[PDB]
Amino acid sequence: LHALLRDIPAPDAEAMARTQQHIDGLLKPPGSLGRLETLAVQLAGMPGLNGTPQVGEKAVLVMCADHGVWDEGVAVSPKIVTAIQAANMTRGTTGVCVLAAQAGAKVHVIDVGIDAEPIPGVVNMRVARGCGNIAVGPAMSRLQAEALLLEVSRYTCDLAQRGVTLFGVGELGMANTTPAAAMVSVFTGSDAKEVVGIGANLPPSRIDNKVDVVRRAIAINQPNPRDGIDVLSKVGGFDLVGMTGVMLGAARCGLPVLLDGFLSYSAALAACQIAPAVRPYLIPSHFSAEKGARIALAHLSMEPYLHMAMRLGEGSGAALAMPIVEAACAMFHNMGELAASNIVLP
Amino acid sequence: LHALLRDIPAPDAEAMARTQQHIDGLLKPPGSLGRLETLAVQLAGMPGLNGTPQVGEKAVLVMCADHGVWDEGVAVSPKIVTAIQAANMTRGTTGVCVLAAQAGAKVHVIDVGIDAEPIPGVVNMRVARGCGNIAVGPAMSRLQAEALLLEVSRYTCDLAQRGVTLFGVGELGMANTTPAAAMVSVFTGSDAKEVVGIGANLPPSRIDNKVDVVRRAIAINQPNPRDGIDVLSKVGGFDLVGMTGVMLGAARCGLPVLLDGFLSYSAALAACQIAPAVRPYLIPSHFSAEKGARIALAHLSMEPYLHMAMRLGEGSGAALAMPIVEAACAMFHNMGELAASNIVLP
Numbered sequence A, B: 001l002h003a004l005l006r007d008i009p010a011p012d013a014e015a016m017a018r019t020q021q022h023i024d025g026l027l028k029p030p031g032s033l034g035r036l037e038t039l040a041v042q043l044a045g046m047p048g049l050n051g052t053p054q055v056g057e058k059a060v061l062v063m064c065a066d067h068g069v070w071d072e073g074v075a076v077s078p079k080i081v082t083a084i085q086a087a088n089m090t091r092g093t094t095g096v097c098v099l100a101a102q103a104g105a106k107v108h109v110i111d112v113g114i115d116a117e118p119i120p121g122v123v124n125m126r127v128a129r130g131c132g133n134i135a136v137g138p139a140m141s142r143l144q145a146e147a148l149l150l151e152v153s154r155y156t157c158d159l160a161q162r163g164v165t166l167f168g169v170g171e172l173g174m175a176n177t178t179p180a181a182a183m184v185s186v187f188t189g190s191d192a193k194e195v196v197g198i199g200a201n202l203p204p205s206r207i208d209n210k211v212d213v214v215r216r217a218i219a220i221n222q223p224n225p226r227d228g229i230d231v232l233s234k235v236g237g238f239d240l241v242g243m244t245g246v247m248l249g250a251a252r253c254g255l256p257v258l259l260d261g262f263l264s265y266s267a268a269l270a271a272c273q274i275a276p277a278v279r280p281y282l283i284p285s286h287f288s289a290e291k292g293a294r295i296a297l298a299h300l301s302m303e304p305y306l307h308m309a310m311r312l313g314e315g316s317g318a319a320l321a322m323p324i325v326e327a328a329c330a331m332f333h334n335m336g337e338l339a340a341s342n343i344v345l346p
């Protein structure tokens, strides 16, 4: 794992410089395409992209797992829904499946800890049948977290060898906005009440209990903010760890990764804490309607492109933003040049 | 024209009700897909869509024209660029062409007043070789504005008969952010300094002159805020009128129209002033980087989906948002249902 984090490539400044120059000469007022231009330059700096903004095959990775903290009454969805919805993923009827199909991306459903019998068609990487209840102890051991990180990392970069150049991250697990909120509180240093949201339609009355649970998790486990792996293993979850692993894997592979919503933000905070070199490869998608979204994004210093008030998860937001990444590439490769039109602009 | 505005259909509440019920039963926590859900319901209410959110052929209409106010030094792009870039539109090398191609939409270039010889391949609807300089008088006569509105309206709804179900509006005309700013000031009641921007890279030093020009245009012409046609003809432009016409045409046709940037906002303010029934058919795309964008959007009571810091125009933002409209339809038609999975959620 040390090898992994060590071998994460830095961005290619040379390719980025040539990219900027090329974009500046396109048939348009310089800088008029704003963030679409900065996005194209960002992509060009990613080694896995061969010095130019391009998109080959696309894949969305959905990490599924159950959480012991569900027993604390922090989620209104039946715990069984995790397993049921995971199966639906293999049938292409879920929200991320439909949006991914629209973007021409393939969805990979990965079981990293569902509390049910194995589901046929789902990638098996389960650590255990659900993680421990973070309210009374750690979710898992440091060893289990590191092992999963390596496993998911390898799998992710392995897909790159199959033609995948753009990744999307997602999750599925009832009650996961609780550990997500806990990690955000720890990494950000914000009070629980400020980052705890309604998740999947949690009644407003039951909000106070969720906040108490998060505080208990932090007080009991005492996660060290300076150690991303410590935080993940103590008040995180298998699914959250998995998402972090996708981020580390793509970064090592020198490829871009599209974040999704609130759950992904917590995983990205952990990933950046573990390896700052991962940051240049992250691409925001939408602005989650979860209460702690603004705080989490501020600390990641990211400004989402899409404001859809979305809060479904599954990687649905990431899939929805893929067309935007492709647009930046289209702009870069298909637009004409000012010089060819004899047009001169300041 | 009175007939036109009179025959604009109201939204189909019955279809919208069935739409909401269907969306609520999809394989996801109720309301979790946020604005994507509200968008699907909006589409369902549009009569031209046959009671369901759907998208057939897509078209982006780019209205091109020159402005006399260019002589006041409010634009740094050579006046000839309007004609040159209009020709490039027919070659598919411009920004809107590339983004439209990515969305699978066809671009229609319409000349409503370019100050140059006719351009082959461009739809000819020119009123005159550029409009009058709004700083010393009106841009055109009320008659010319009404005639163009009718002509563009008919053309727009005529495309609907060819299979087009989703429209995008755009423009091309050096110095058009000046009359656009003037209209925004008048309709909104805001001071010129608050809504005048840099347009296509206007030097910061030259901003004061642009503001003075806008004030002069308003003082000299005395446009009546309560009369959208009066405002358009006095301190507007041929291109701006054309965009308004696309909005009225699609609304009459009961079809959705995607707005673009700042220029489109001014046209939408005029359209809504002329016929409030047009509002339900308008769909925002991105949030323009032009200074007066926030003010204009507030008065239209619209919240763009995309935050790309874009400021190119041409209808590039509208094309970029088309995939989002298609996603709402995909969600509506392709997602599975909770009942079929025996899943129950509050």
Ligand SMILES: O=P(O)(O)OC[C@H]1O[C@H](n2cnc3ccccc32)[C@H](O)[C@@H]1O
Binding pocket: A074, A075, A076, A077, A081, A085, A171, A172, A173, A174, A175, A176, A177, A178, A198, A199, A200, A201, A202, A312, A313, A314, B027, B028, B029
């Ligand atoms: O903390 P919570 O309140 O439980 O909210 C997080 C959960 O809701 C989302 N989620 C995504 N798809 C879903 C289908 C059914 C139910 C929930 C679903 C997340 O993917 C996760 O499963």
Ligand SMILES: O=P(O)(O)OC[C@H]1O[C@H](n2cnc3ccccc32)[C@H](O)[C@@H]1O
Binding pocket: A027, A028, A029, B074, B075, B076, B077, B081, B085, B171, B172, B173, B174, B175, B176, B177, B178, B198, B199, B200, B201, B202, B312, B313, B314
């Ligand atoms: O008021 P202004 O400062 O002139 O800014 C408005 C102009 O810039 C944009 N615009 C769009 N495509 C362009 C290509 C070359 C130059 C400008 C262009 C608008 O479409 C319009 O032509």
Ligand SMILES: O=C(O)c1cccnc1
Binding pocket: A177, A198, A199, A200, A260, A261, A262, A263, A264, A288, A289, A290, A310, A311, A312, A313, A314
């Ligand atoms: O932002 C998300 O991804 C999210 C928010 C609430 C519930 N589930 C997912």
Ligand SMILES: O=C(O)c1cccnc1
Binding pocket: B177, B198, B199, B200, B260, B261, B262, B263, B264, B288, B289, B290, B310, B311, B312, B313, B314
């Ligand atoms: O918002 C726009 O469409 C825009 C802003 C500046 C210059 N041209 C177009």
